Design an enzyme around this catalytic site. Structure first.
Site, mmCIF file in Angstrom:
data_model
loop_
_atom_site.group_PDB
_atom_site.id
_atom_site.type_symbol
_atom_site.label_atom_id
_atom_site.label_comp_id
_atom_site.label_asym_id
_atom_site.label_seq_id
_atom_site.Cartn_x
_atom_site.Cartn_y
_atom_site.Cartn_z
ATOM 1 N N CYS A 65 -13.557 2.194 16.396
ATOM 2 C CA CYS A 65 -12.201 1.659 16.337
ATOM 3 C C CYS A 65 -11.418 1.681 17.622
ATOM 4 C CB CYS A 65 -11.358 2.372 15.271
ATOM 5 S SG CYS A 65 -9.747 1.574 15.123
ATOM 6 N N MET A 66 -11.138 2.869 18.162
ATOM 7 C CA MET A 66 -10.286 2.964 19.347
ATOM 8 C C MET A 66 -11.006 3.325 20.646
ATOM 9 S SD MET A 66 -7.665 1.778 17.923
ATOM 10 C CE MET A 66 -6.532 1.799 19.377
ATOM 11 N N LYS A 77 0.817 -1.221 0.000
ATOM 12 C CA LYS A 77 0.000 0.000 0.000
ATOM 13 C C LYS A 77 0.846 1.264 0.000
ATOM 14 C CE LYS A 77 -2.465 -0.886 3.521
ATOM 15 N NZ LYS A 77 -1.747 -2.206 3.752
ATOM 16 N N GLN A 133 -5.815 3.571 12.447
ATOM 17 C CA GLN A 133 -5.718 4.779 11.625
ATOM 18 C C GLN A 133 -4.459 5.601 11.851
ATOM 19 O OE1 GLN A 133 -9.420 7.190 10.480
ATOM 20 N NE2 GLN A 133 -9.991 6.031 12.334
HETATM 21 N N1 LIG Z 1 -4.210 -3.591 4.815
HETATM 22 C C1 LIG Z 1 -4.828 -2.793 5.703
HETATM 23 N N2 LIG Z 1 -4.276 -2.504 6.902
HETATM 24 C C2 LIG Z 1 -4.913 -1.714 7.794
HETATM 25 C C3 LIG Z 1 -6.238 -1.156 7.454
HETATM 26 C C4 LIG Z 1 -6.758 -1.544 6.122
HETATM 27 O O1 LIG Z 1 -7.834 -1.162 5.681
HETATM 28 N N3 LIG Z 1 -6.026 -2.322 5.346
HETATM 29 N N4 LIG Z 1 -6.889 -0.355 8.342
HETATM 30 C C5 LIG Z 1 -6.290 -0.035 9.621
HETATM 31 C C6 LIG Z 1 -7.305 0.185 10.704
HETATM 32 S S1 LIG Z 1 -7.925 1.761 10.822
HETATM 33 C C7 LIG Z 1 -7.601 -0.792 11.605
HETATM 34 S S2 LIG Z 1 -8.693 -0.492 12.873
HETATM 35 C C8 LIG Z 1 -6.842 -2.121 11.610
HETATM 36 C C9 LIG Z 1 -7.620 -3.395 11.973
HETATM 37 O O2 LIG Z 1 -6.601 -4.410 12.121
HETATM 38 P P1 LIG Z 1 -6.868 -5.899 12.684
HETATM 39 O O3 LIG Z 1 -7.820 -5.780 13.836
HETATM 40 O O4 LIG Z 1 -5.564 -6.594 12.917
HETATM 41 O O5 LIG Z 1 -7.458 -6.602 11.377
HETATM 42 P P2 LIG Z 1 -9.006 -6.824 11.028
HETATM 43 O O6 LIG Z 1 -9.049 -7.486 9.667
HETATM 44 O O7 LIG Z 1 -9.822 -5.606 11.264
HETATM 45 O O8 LIG Z 1 -9.393 -7.893 12.177
HETATM 46 C C10 LIG Z 1 -9.699 -9.269 11.987
HETATM 47 C C11 LIG Z 1 -9.174 -9.904 13.272
HETATM 48 O O9 LIG Z 1 -10.189 -9.871 14.276
HETATM 49 C C12 LIG Z 1 -10.005 -10.984 15.145
HETATM 50 N N5 LIG Z 1 -11.206 -11.344 15.952
HETATM 51 C C13 LIG Z 1 -12.450 -11.658 15.529
HETATM 52 N N6 LIG Z 1 -13.275 -11.933 16.582
HETATM 53 C C14 LIG Z 1 -12.552 -11.779 17.700
HETATM 54 C C15 LIG Z 1 -12.776 -11.891 19.159
HETATM 55 O O10 LIG Z 1 -13.871 -12.222 19.650
HETATM 56 N N7 LIG Z 1 -11.756 -11.653 19.972
HETATM 57 C C16 LIG Z 1 -10.534 -11.317 19.518
HETATM 58 N N8 LIG Z 1 -9.553 -11.073 20.435
HETATM 59 N N9 LIG Z 1 -10.257 -11.200 18.205
HETATM 60 C C17 LIG Z 1 -11.200 -11.404 17.273
HETATM 61 C C18 LIG Z 1 -9.531 -12.086 14.227
HETATM 62 O O11 LIG Z 1 -8.637 -12.898 14.994
HETATM 63 C C19 LIG Z 1 -8.725 -11.358 13.174
HETATM 64 O O12 LIG Z 1 -7.360 -11.470 13.612
HETATM 65 O O13 LIG Z 1 -6.070 -2.322 10.417
HETATM 66 C C20 LIG Z 1 -5.328 -1.130 10.084
HETATM 67 N N10 LIG Z 1 -4.402 -1.409 9.008
HETATM 68 N N1 LIG Z 2 -17.693 -4.257 8.806
HETATM 69 C C1 LIG Z 2 -16.636 -3.576 9.287
HETATM 70 N N2 LIG Z 2 -16.764 -2.230 9.336
HETATM 71 C C2 LIG Z 2 -15.806 -1.425 9.816
HETATM 72 C C3 LIG Z 2 -14.564 -2.055 10.261
HETATM 73 C C4 LIG Z 2 -14.471 -3.537 10.173
HETATM 74 O O1 LIG Z 2 -13.436 -4.139 10.531
HETATM 75 N N3 LIG Z 2 -15.515 -4.219 9.699
HETATM 76 N N4 LIG Z 2 -13.587 -1.262 10.731
HETATM 77 C C5 LIG Z 2 -13.918 0.017 11.337
HETATM 78 C C6 LIG Z 2 -12.681 0.828 11.550
HETATM 79 S S1 LIG Z 2 -11.513 0.210 12.594
HETATM 80 C C7 LIG Z 2 -12.491 2.003 10.975
HETATM 81 S S2 LIG Z 2 -11.119 2.904 11.419
HETATM 82 C C8 LIG Z 2 -13.535 2.553 10.026
HETATM 83 C C9 LIG Z 2 -12.986 3.403 8.878
HETATM 84 O O2 LIG Z 2 -14.044 3.835 8.012
HETATM 85 P P1 LIG Z 2 -13.894 5.119 7.054
HETATM 86 O O3 LIG Z 2 -12.803 6.003 7.649
HETATM 87 O O4 LIG Z 2 -15.259 5.721 6.800
HETATM 88 O O5 LIG Z 2 -13.449 4.439 5.682
HETATM 89 P P2 LIG Z 2 -12.329 5.071 4.719
HETATM 90 O O6 LIG Z 2 -12.390 4.245 3.441
HETATM 91 O O7 LIG Z 2 -11.044 5.199 5.517
HETATM 92 O O8 LIG Z 2 -12.831 6.563 4.502
HETATM 93 C C10 LIG Z 2 -11.895 7.625 4.210
HETATM 94 C C11 LIG Z 2 -12.515 8.549 3.151
HETATM 95 O O9 LIG Z 2 -11.877 9.823 2.971
HETATM 96 C C12 LIG Z 2 -11.577 10.081 1.589
HETATM 97 N N5 LIG Z 2 -10.403 10.914 1.753
HETATM 98 C C13 LIG Z 2 -9.103 10.627 1.580
HETATM 99 N N6 LIG Z 2 -8.345 11.707 1.936
HETATM 100 C C14 LIG Z 2 -9.165 12.692 2.360
HETATM 101 C C15 LIG Z 2 -9.046 14.073 2.899
HETATM 102 O O10 LIG Z 2 -7.929 14.631 3.065
HETATM 103 N N7 LIG Z 2 -10.199 14.712 3.205
HETATM 104 C C16 LIG Z 2 -11.427 14.162 3.053
HETATM 105 N N8 LIG Z 2 -12.529 14.861 3.371
HETATM 106 N N9 LIG Z 2 -11.597 12.910 2.600
HETATM 107 C C17 LIG Z 2 -10.526 12.145 2.246
HETATM 108 C C18 LIG Z 2 -11.378 8.695 1.048
HETATM 109 O O11 LIG Z 2 -11.834 8.754 -0.277
HETATM 110 C C19 LIG Z 2 -12.410 7.886 1.796
HETATM 111 O O12 LIG Z 2 -13.701 8.019 1.169
HETATM 112 O O13 LIG Z 2 -14.309 1.487 9.476
HETATM 113 C C20 LIG Z 2 -14.977 0.780 10.518
HETATM 114 N N10 LIG Z 2 -15.975 -0.079 9.901
HETATM 115 S S1 SF4 Z 3 2.410 2.842 7.337
HETATM 116 FE FE1 SF4 Z 3 1.229 0.852 7.176
HETATM 117 S S2 SF4 Z 3 0.236 0.898 5.106
HETATM 118 FE FE2 SF4 Z 3 1.852 2.483 5.107
HETATM 119 S S3 SF4 Z 3 3.762 1.454 4.316
HETATM 120 FE FE3 SF4 Z 3 3.911 1.234 6.615
HETATM 121 S S4 SF4 Z 3 2.892 -0.737 7.157
HETATM 122 FE FE4 SF4 Z 3 2.307 -0.192 4.980
HETATM 123 MO MO LIG Z 4 -9.629 1.709 12.640
#
Ligand SMILES: Nc1nc2c(c(=O)[nH]1)N[C@H]1C(S)=C(S)[C@@H](COP(=O)(O)OP(=O)(O)OC[C@H]3O[C@@H](n4cnc5c(=O)[nH]c(N)nc54)[C@H](O)[C@@H]3O)O[C@H]1N2
Ligand SMILES: Nc1nc2c(c(=O)[nH]1)N[C@H]1C(S)=C(S)[C@@H](COP(=O)(O)OP(=O)(O)OC[C@H]3O[C@@H](n4cnc5c(=O)[nH]c(N)nc54)[C@H](O)[C@@H]3O)O[C@H]1N2
Ligand code: SF4
Ligand SMILES: [Mo+6]
Length: 791
Positions: free
Chosen positions: A143-144, A47, A374
């Site tokens: 998220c957090m 990425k 994030q």
């Molecule tokens: N490639 C990539 N990397 C990212 C992001 C992305 O979009 N793409 N987004 C970023 C953001 S903002 C976030 S929040 C993170 C999320 O990062 P992670 O939380 O590491 O990854 P996810 O795919 O959201 O989570 C799936 C995980 O949830 C766990 N799980 C499911 N049910 C349970 C439960 O009951 N208990 C426990 N302990 N675990 C459970 C599974 O073991 C699996 O490991 O990734 C961050 N980094």
């Molecule tokens: N089912 C399911 N849902 C989830 C999660 C999951 O594991 N499972 N994870 C949750 C978690 S941990 C997170 S953090 C959230 C994230 O959810 P979102 O933050 O709503 O998803 P993103 O795709 O990060 O949205 C970012 C948006 O901003 C736009 N963008 C990029 N740069 C800029 C900028 O400078 N300004 C503005 N205005 N826009 C910009 C991008 O096009 C994109 O549309 O999703 C949550 N929802």
């Molecule tokens: S900050 Fe995360 S998404 Fe970006 S290069 Fe490093 S590990 Fe990959």
């Molecule tokens: Mo998050």
């Protein structure tokens, strides 16, 4: 004409890799690992690698689009181009009418951990100090929020007390559901180095499904959803049972409390599980005796644990044995598994106990480390306080003394900041559905696609003709298409920026390029809007009678162009340095805001470095005190807030001690039953970010993973007449999506559990999910619901 390189943190995950960005002729054409960034030391995931394509998506928005029907706004109208002047007219009128008819509570903003620190700060001021509404809440509530409430309960200050440097010093790594191989790749590779180069190092990885992180697991464990609470309690038991309490640490530095139980699931009060709740949404607790606690965790026997989780008895013992061993430096890692969880705050506290009983905390190589997803969930959303209950630096709107500091510093009347907690993320969904929230501006978020349970609350609410929805985005998303006004937005390196990552490292970046068309940054949007309002239009008269010198002043003059925010002249910028906002408004807006904001936390444990220091450094981890960044918090020697001879001060609590909370297992809101026979978990994939609006606009990221699949166990497909590659309909009580069968992908769920990623805008998995939250953090449990497949 040679490529120009300058630092920036990566636009993506919370690891916060330092990157060198190469520009030429007003474009970003190259991007590389910054060798001298201590986070990644040149490394990079696919990425980070494709950062130069994310801005040049095909259909960037260049112009405000309003829904319009013969010459005027209409809810059912067609997006039509209008000017910025006109977009602010409509917004002006909409906000002003809502304030007139139902007041500040009927107006809301949905912000982001992807905002720049100053964008977050500006937004908060607008809403809290300007409009007098706390209906600002972020991204980060999904998220957090659970980890944050956990910190506040256990420590009284937010954010980890260790740092990434713990990796190459750890004896053991336990991932509590973190898929770090995919979601924190640079961390993973650093862990992988540690493990692979050192035989006495162990790695335990617990997950709900087998994934890529299992590869490096010495102790790879698959448990039942929710059962982590059992394991967590069990290990604590084991530590006592094995006389492994670090007595000295326990004596000086820990209190014990018992938490209130049977708390419901942060659903609408009409819901069976809320009516059934005993103590619905209570975070209450009482001091607890040691033997009370020891009796409490004694319930959690090796035998019961094995049954409740499906995990082999000897593997549970190998695991607890790492915490108990007095010479094993342990790092614990968690992400959404713990946080997106109906007892996630409990989870968080529960894992801290493990560290707090054993004294394994705030030392190099040894500590519990809450990961952040994030890039600026910490630096923006959490540190500025872009939440409904928040003021800068861990401060709460609920505290009259907190309100005072902020009102005094910002130079607004006494009592202008409102005391009532605003609407959290899911509550905004609920209020919209109800016509209670009528003006709603989303920024830097894709909530129609990212927020839980689309069909029930958010879609009907957004589409409701009593409501006016605004989204600011560089691209026409699912969210933008569902709105009434779309504001074209500057992104990443098209602006001056600041992001704060998971290890408290704040990272700046100069503007390197310019946005297409009339795209403006979120900071411009918010700050130009503020000029559309006079104090007499937002503040009540008897607030004004306290400082009559602010009568006739705009929220612009009052929140952003004050002598303080505007101390800093444009002459401070390099002659050839881009800064659209500051060059427009004629002062260094980002720094003035930054320096007013930093003031709250300086000298109160949250110390941010002088603005200009970050523009030189590859980031600094706070507290930054007398030039010197902090790697470990709360331990003597490492943290300048700990006096000589104290050993450990958790100065977030009046008495300086951390708190262990005895908290039971309670079941997930929705478990599989006869009809909906499968567990559904959700999350991400290496090659996509969130809703994919950025990464799917990258030709080759799209080509690596064009569509969302459904990861399913061979026999679960076998038993259903489903073959790898089959089109498959996934159905919950709340909605349905059509996906593709995957029996042989990277994620191998055990039988009974199905898993699905949310990046794909055609396969909206959040039509299925249940908007049940942790009742304390209000964080949605995306990981856990019940589902069925039809062909
Ligand atoms: N490639 C990539 N990397 C990212 C992001 C992305 O979009 N793409 N987004 C970023 C953001 S903002 C976030 S929040 C993170 C999320 O990062 P992670 O939380 O590491 O990854 P996810 O795919 O959201 O989570 C799936 C995980 O949830 C766990 N799980 C499911 N049910 C349970 C439960 O009951 N208990 C426990 N302990 N675990 C459970 C599974 O073991 C699996 O490991 O990734 C961050 N980094
Ligand atoms: N089912 C399911 N849902 C989830 C999660 C999951 O594991 N499972 N994870 C949750 C978690 S941990 C997170 S953090 C959230 C994230 O959810 P979102 O933050 O709503 O998803 P993103 O795709 O990060 O949205 C970012 C948006 O901003 C736009 N963008 C990029 N740069 C800029 C900028 O400078 N300004 C503005 N205005 N826009 C910009 C991008 O096009 C994109 O549309 O999703 C949550 N929802
Ligand atoms: S900050 Fe995360 S998404 Fe970006 S290069 Fe490093 S590990 Fe990959
Ligand atoms: Mo998050």
């Amino acid at each position: 004409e040679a490529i120009k390189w300058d630092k920036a943190p990566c636009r993506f995950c919370g690891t916060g890799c330092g990157v060198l960005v190469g520009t030429q002729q007003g474009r970003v054409v190259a991007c590389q690992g910054d060798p001298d960034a201590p986070v990644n030391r040149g490394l990079n995931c696919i990425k980070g690698y494709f950062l130069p394509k994310i801005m040049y998506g095909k259909d960037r928005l260049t112009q405000p689009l309003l829904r319009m029907k013969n010459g005027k706004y209409d809810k059912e109208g067609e997006f039509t181009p209008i000017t910025w002047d006109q977009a602010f007219d409509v917004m002006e009128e909409k906000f002003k009418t809502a304030l007139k008819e139902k007041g500040p509570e009927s107006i809301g903003m949905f912000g982001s951990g992807q905002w720049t620190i100053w964008e977050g700060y500006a937004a908060s001021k607008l809403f809290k100090a300007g409009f007098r509404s706390n209906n600002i809440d972020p991204n980060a509530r999904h998220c957090m929020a659970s980890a944050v409430v956990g910190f506040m309960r256990t420590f009284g200050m937010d954010e980890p007390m260790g740092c990434y440097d713990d990796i190459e010093q750890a004896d053991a790594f336990v991932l509590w559901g973190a898929n770090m191989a995919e979601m924190h790749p640079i961390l993973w590779s650093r862990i992988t180095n540690r493990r692979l180069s050192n035989q006495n190092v162990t790695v335990a990885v617990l997950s709900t499904y087998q994934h890529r992180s299992f590869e490096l697991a010495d102790n790879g464990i698959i448990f039942t959803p929710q059962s982590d609470l059992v394991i967590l309690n069990y290990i604590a038991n084991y530590i006592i049972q094995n006389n492994a309490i670090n007595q000295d640490f326990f004596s000086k530095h820990v209190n014990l409390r018992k938490g209130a139980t049977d708390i419901g699931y942060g659903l609408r009060p009409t819901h069976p599980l809320e009516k059934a709740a005993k103590n619905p949404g209570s975070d209450a607790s009482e001091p607890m005796s040691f033997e009370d606690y020891k009796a409490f965790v004694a319930e959690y026997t090796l035998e019961k644990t094995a049954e409740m989780t499906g995990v082999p008895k000897d593997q549970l013992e190998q695991l607890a044995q790492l915490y108990a061993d007095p010479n094993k430096k342990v790092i614990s890692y968690w992400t959404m598994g713990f946080n997106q969880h109906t007892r996630g705050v409990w989870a968080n506290n529960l894992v801290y106990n493990l560290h707090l009983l054993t004294g394994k905390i705030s030392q190099p190589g040894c500590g519990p480390f809450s990961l952040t997803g994030q890039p600026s969930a910490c630096g923006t959303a959490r540190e500025v306080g872009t939440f409904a209950h928040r003021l800068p630096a861990d401060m709460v709107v609920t505290n009259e003394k907190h309100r005072d500091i902020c009102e005094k510093k910002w130079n607004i009347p006494s009592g202008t900041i409102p005391a009532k907690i605003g609407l959290h993320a899911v509550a905004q969904d609920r209020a919209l559905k109800d016509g209670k929230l009528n003006v709603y501006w989303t920024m830097c978020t894709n909530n129609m696609q990212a927020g839980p349970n689309i069909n029930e609350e958010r879609m009907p609410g957004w589409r409701d003709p009593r409501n006016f929805i605004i989204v600011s985005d560089p691209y026409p998303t699912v969210s933008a298409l569902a709105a009434d006004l779309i504001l074209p937005t500057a992104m990443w390196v098209e602006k001056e920026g600041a992001y704060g990552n998971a290890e408290r490292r704040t990272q700046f970046w100069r503007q390197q390029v310019q946005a297409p068309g009339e795209a403006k940054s979120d900071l411009w949007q918010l700050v130009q809007f503020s000029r559309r309002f006079k104090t007499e239009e937002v503040w009540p008269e008897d607030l004004l009678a306290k400082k009559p010198e602010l009568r006739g002043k705009t929220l612009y003059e009052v929140l952003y162009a004050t002598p303080e925010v505007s101390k800093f002249p444009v002459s401070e910028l390099a002659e050839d340095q881009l800064n659209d906002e500051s060059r427009e408004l004629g002062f260094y807006l980002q720094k003035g805001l930054f320096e007013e904001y930093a003031w709250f936390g300086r000298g109160h444990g949250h110390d941010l470095a002088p603005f200009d220091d970050y523009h030189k450094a590859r980031g600094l981890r706070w507290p930054v005190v007398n030039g010197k960044e902090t790697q470990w918090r709360y331990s003597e020697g490492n943290d300048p807030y700990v006096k000589a001879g104290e050993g450990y001060k958790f100065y977030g609590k009046p008495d300086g001690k951390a708190v262990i909370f005895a908290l039971p297992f309670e079941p997930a809101a929705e478990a599989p039953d006869e009809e909906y026979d499968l567990w559904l978990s959700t999350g991400r994939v290496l090659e996509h970010w969130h809703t994919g609006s950025m990464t799917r606009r990258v030709p080759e990221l799209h080509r690596a993973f064009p569509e969302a699949v459904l990861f399913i166990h061979p026999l679960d497909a076998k038993a259903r007449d489903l073959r790898r590659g089959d089109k498959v309909k996934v159905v919950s009580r709340r909605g349905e999506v059509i996906s593709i069968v995957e029996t042989r992908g990277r994620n191998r769920p055990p039988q009974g559990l199905v898993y699905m990623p949310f990046f794909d805008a055609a396969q909206l998995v959040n039509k299925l999910t249940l908007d049940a939250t942790d009742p304390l953090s209000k964080e949605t449990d995306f990981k856990k619901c019940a589902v069925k497949l039809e062909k």
